[PDB]
Amino acid sequence: MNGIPVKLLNEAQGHIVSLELTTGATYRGKLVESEDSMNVQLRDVIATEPQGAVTHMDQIFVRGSQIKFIVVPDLLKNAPLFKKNSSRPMPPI
Amino acid sequence: MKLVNFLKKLRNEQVTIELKNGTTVWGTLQSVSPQMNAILTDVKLTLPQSNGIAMASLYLTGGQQNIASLQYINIRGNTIRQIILPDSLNLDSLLVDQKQLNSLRRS
């Protein structure tokens, strides 16, 4: 259905992440609320245009197809989404 | 009637692939996804006579020492421009389309 990477992107909500866009502009800020379509909203945004300059947005909202990548913090190195043999405690009928 | 199932019958076939960037990849096929994400081994890839982005993509894969010899490359579907099959393979027997034959028999 959804998959592991979109669940990991929805996992790190409310944390300082860093995006890079397809044009080359790198954003960095606190993730407000991520979605399954990766259309992600950031706050306290610092932006670097592909020309080179640095600016600051207050509340950005980027579409998921114009994202090169996004960096989650390192404590999500150890996540239960990464566990291969985690069993399921009795799903409901 | 997707012809990716035609490429699924092409295991251990020694082919070339021209990509959309311009790189020619000579290697044997191992497997291919139904989304045409094809893996290859015993690979040499070459950017012919330019595109500096393609030269960067050619060199920055490890194993350059402009023919680059690599052991294992997975290739995404949308980067495949065309794939050239060996002429010794018979296309009349590999394109039998047994799924299409079962669909015609089910009609």
Partner: protein, 121 residues
Amino acid sequence: SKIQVAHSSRLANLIDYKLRVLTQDGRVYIGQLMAFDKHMNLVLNECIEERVPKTQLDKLRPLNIKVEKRVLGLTILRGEQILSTVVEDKPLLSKKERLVRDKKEKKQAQKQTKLRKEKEK
């Protein structure tokens, strides 16, 4: 690089390998994969992104090449703007040690299910 990547392996078998994944730009990401999906969205542990400058490209056109490396750490890369992925370096622990670790994870998961069944009673 004398690694001898497996001849009949796929993305479920290439997990926890130090990949060297190529993109459309050529911005090569080096790091361990830990997950994928249908769109080939790859998470990358201890990842580094390497490029070549425009001045180095003239020397690269037909020796030493000074690549520009930035450190990303644990990132999550999309499958749209990527081109190809290879296996660069083998992981630390071996296949038998990963097998013993997977058996320990299975026994720990079965013990956790027995603990949930004991707490449910």
